[PDB]
Point group: C5
Chain length 311, copies 5
């Protein structure tokens, strides 16, 4: 069960290929996704070569135990992949054609800074560690790389499954390692975003601005504070549908700015009343009348600035 010796002083290329059968369970929080696929490997072990005339067979089938197979692993997997050998076939030249069906919870990092308009690149990193007797490098057989059309990620759009053909060969713990990058590109499709999240949140915010057409401090306090409780309650409602990140996101910025417009509104309401009370009613009414065009315009600009900064 030794590796195949070299003809000359060359490494062994193992011709890889992942075919996605069923991609599912993307955990935006944990930055994981479970995948169920085919892994196809191919190398040349001349020890296993045969004359198809004497053998009377075109292709000899082997058990994993019977022949030498390279130790292929995944870099960013949670635990060991649940792989099951489908077929091992040796052509007369000694070309081994290996196939296995596996399933693994992959760990690719996610970027929600542009949420819900963010797009991702999910990584599946294939490694192989060079042995003492001979060095091993990974190749990409593009014919054996693809994805099933049924493969779905609800709320996403599966764009492309490609692979960086060039391996990232490097040194590790005194041995050569050959790494390959398999990239799954998914772009978000949150259709019900503006009616589920933005629209009711803008309604609750606009309700507060009716305090610029009112003069009752008691009515204005109710308007601005009560809508503020409504805003918070609504955020607890859409808490589920929102990115729980240590960094500021696009949607997250909008929401923040909204809490600020509640604060500024309160200040107005308080000032209008203080001026009214301090017998400066002309200034009081001037402000409430200005706020009527000021608050909507400033909101619109600040939101245009935001969108520009994130995109």
């Amino acid at each position: 069960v030794s590796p195949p010796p070299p003809i000359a002083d060359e490494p062994l290329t193992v011709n890889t290929g992942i075919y996605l059968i069923e991609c599912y369970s993307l955990d935006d929080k944990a930055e994981t996704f479970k995948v169920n696929a085919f892994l196809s490997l191919s190398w040349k072990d001349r020890r296993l070569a045969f004359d198809p005339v004497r053998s009377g067979v075109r292709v000899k089938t082997y058990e994993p135990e019977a022949i030498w197979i390279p130790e292929i692993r995944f870099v960013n997997v949670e635990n060991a992949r649940d792989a099951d050998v489908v077929d091992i076939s040796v052509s007369p030249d000694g070309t081994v054609q290996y196939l296995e069906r596996f399933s693994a919870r992959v760990l690719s990092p996610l970027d929600f800074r542009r949420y819900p308009f963010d797009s991702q690149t999910l990584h599946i990193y294939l490694i192989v560690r060079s042995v003492d007797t001979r060095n091993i490098v990974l190749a990409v057989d593009l014919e054996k790389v693809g994805k099933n059309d049924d493969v779905f990620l609800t709320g996403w759009d599966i764009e492309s499954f490609t692979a960086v053909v060039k391996p990232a060969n490097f040194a590790l713990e005194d041995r050569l390692e050959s790494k390959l990058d398999y990239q799954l590109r998914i772009s978000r499709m949150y259709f019900s975003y503006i009616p589920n999240i933005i629209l009711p949140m803008l309604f609750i915010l606009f309700i507060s601005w009716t305090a610029f057409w009112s003069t009752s401090y008691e009515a204005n306090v109710t308007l601005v504070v009560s809508t503020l409780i409504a805003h918070i309650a609504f955020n607890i409602l859409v808490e589920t549908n929102l990115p729980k990140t240590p960094y500021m996101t696009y949607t997250g910025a909008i929401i923040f700015m909204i809490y600020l417009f509640y604060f500024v509104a309160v200040i107005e309401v308080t000032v209008q009343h203080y001026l009214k009370v301090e017998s400066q009613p002309a200034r009081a009414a001037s402000i409430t009348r200005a706020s009527r065009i000021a608050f909507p315009v400033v909101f619109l600009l600040a939101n245009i600035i935001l969108a520009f900064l994130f995109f």
Copy 2:
């Protein structure tokens, strides 16, 4: 062992049959369902044939290790199915009758656009990959296909377990694959829907409309904003019982429209008061009196339109 050699240039039919023992744990979010069933396969391996006179037995029982068994897999499963061989029986001609009891978390997509009146078609896809020496196709033995009467999905109605008899044989990674479609049809039975979700939500909304029989801006602000907080609180309460989807659903549309009727009501309340204040009390009262019939009628039409658009 090796596969059984052909009489002629025909393929080997493996006569499949799934009998649902206990279907359970449907995760509307993950679009999964766990199933516990019997898988029955049958093929003819003439190598295993015998004279029942000399053997002194009518049917010989075998261990999976002892004889060749086809590599049958599921396409849309999360991990490998937890199968346990029940019985392997060979008749004197070499007809193998295999039976196993398995359990697997299946991944069929779900459609909640018509919630809570939606119905589903759960798929269980059976494959087999053709070997180098001989090609393999799947057949459906309808006698060995059914479901237990006890099989329950709480809140659903299990209608039919059928299978597309015709296999979808296709090319994959340079080998013949034979696919079978087993379909489980379930139609929703949400009995407590109108009293758990719709009725209290309509009450909270009607309470707001009492502001059309009021003239106190301070009472109307309390009525329309406070019921709005009640609406949001109620949604957090029924949050559990509602479809968390990236697309707009039926119930989801109703709810949206309700947040809009809160916004429109506030506008009314604000306008009635502004006219009252601007010494146009006739216009103010005309509106509040109109809103009295306007809001209920428009709600009813818009809800009739909705139902028609979704069904």
Copy 3:
């Protein structure tokens, strides 16, 4: 090994018996419960008979491999039971006495229509499939059926562990199946129900009725709407302790009726004010005075009707 041949044309009775060691983890939502128990089986395999004089032994102990054992399974289990053979003992006549300790997540349906006064019957169904050479039927050895006194289900009262002695023998996929019904009876013991759920919910409701001793529309709107938000908030608080079902439950009906009494109260408040406003103050006060006895009495009757309808 082969099954034991019949003396005559009789089936083989396997004398079953489940002894519950530790019953736990009942998931009211999933309708599951995990159980840890002993399964005792006994049959007569005359091939294994011996003369205790020559053998010099009263009982011979065997390994599962060494002797024939019937394929016993559970019908309503999630996955395969984690069983471990305790002891296999053969008496001189050939009577095999098998014992194993297992653990399985059982799937019995639950009925919460009468919550929190509901009682359940948890089912553990034992099957055995008849072989080609001989048919097999299950018997109940009542001596080997019981439960440990320590066995607890927090919030329940474990009443009785009994079994329908008569097996439900039936045809399946062309073979005889012998089914047994093991029934675990548990009756709910929700002691802190009236102070955790009912009492604070009645207080929040009574607070609203103080609007019948008030004449301030502005105070009444606060009373009826604010307590309504308090009711909803309280429901979110007891959300945990309540049955999440597709059907209407007892507690669920009470709660519904309460949302209706909020609606009716609002109507009153609105009417009293409209009459007061429309210079019909005599009618206005007549209603508020009537509501004072009307609301409590109607509540009491409607609640008496409810209890009668559910019990």
Copy 4:
């Protein structure tokens, strides 16, 4: 292998000892705790005795397969313990010294009646079933019983790991069973209890009592009802940190009483206003002035009574 024969008509004592390596994951809801430990057993199998002169060795090491080992199990475990044999050592007399490292989710019942001042006794029950040929009893070797000092349960204080030396030998399914009680004593250490739970809850309650220094029914209704919503909201906030039990707990009683003080306060507010309105202002003010000392004193007594009843 067979069990060791007796010298005389005596049973075999298996000298047990559990050493807690890492105790963790206590699920107050499920009444479970996961433990990682050493199990040390010792018995005398004279068949394995040797003369250390001829053998030239002091202690012979054996594989579990090679020698007879007693079937030791846990009573209250969820599934079978994940045990791994560390060492098996036989002294010249035939004294087997077995050691294994295991991990199991134990199921001990919990008592939260005195929460957050409750203390628990976690049980680990060791059994062994007597064989047909000889009976087996369990002994405690106190030298081999202890716990690591690092062993932590966050929010608890691990007091003592002791064992009831005397086994509870009993009859089960016609065989002798020998049970041992290993007790882990943990006393609660909820430090941030009064500032996380009690203090903000008393503040929200006191705010309501400011209604005794007010005469505005409209202000009092806001005070007593709004603080009531604040109380409910706060309970939803500390919902996580509170015992979800079918029985009444200490903290649970305090909370209940608080909902009652809200009810009584509302009654006051309503009565004071009704008397004021019914031109009995002297009685109205007498009550509000009394409530000022009445509510705090009654709260303090009722809370003293409570604490006395639970402790």
Copy 5:
């Protein structure tokens, strides 16, 4: 196989080294983290030595079964690590160079007292138990200790992976144990902290202080109580992002103090009104005017004190 005999009366040093491949899934609540890594061990077994001239090979590769390997375990792991041997290489002197890839859920305690500015030290404890025939001690080969640069913990900053070179050799259950401390240092990086948690919480608090520029008791009660409900609602919103601990944390203290400033504000509001009412309007206005500078300054000091006490 047996362990390697000593040259003299010296123990066997096993030269350890952990290289972190992918560190992930840190459960702040459970105080656990899952890690996927390489474990490299090396010792000298002279029985395995060879002359590379006669063997004609530089390094001989072995199967775990073929040669003796030390029983290395982890102390603070939940269950047994999912290890898979990568390579076993023996140099001519008998130096075994072992490598395995493992994955384990580690259990290190966490300190959130300084949250969200807290830093942690995650522990991975390696043990080996001395055998009867020879004692074993662990050494650290610093060359074989490191971490991949891709290794991420979202919201944290992975600072250093080091190891206490000196083993903590001790007596346990009458045998020598050799323990090693591998330390992973992570410092928190909560970027969106002040806008996600602090800023909206300060806004809700400031809104309450506008009651010092108001004289309407009815407006002040709404201001202070309503913002109090907003505070509680906001805490339920950031409940997810906050440390659930039995001890007081930094952020936890800030929040507490905020509930106290709500209480103090209510007292003010109530006092100002009582003095106004008791015909002492000069004192009433003096207080409200003082509170205007008093509340902000006292808040700032108390927060400066806090920060100093925690840091």
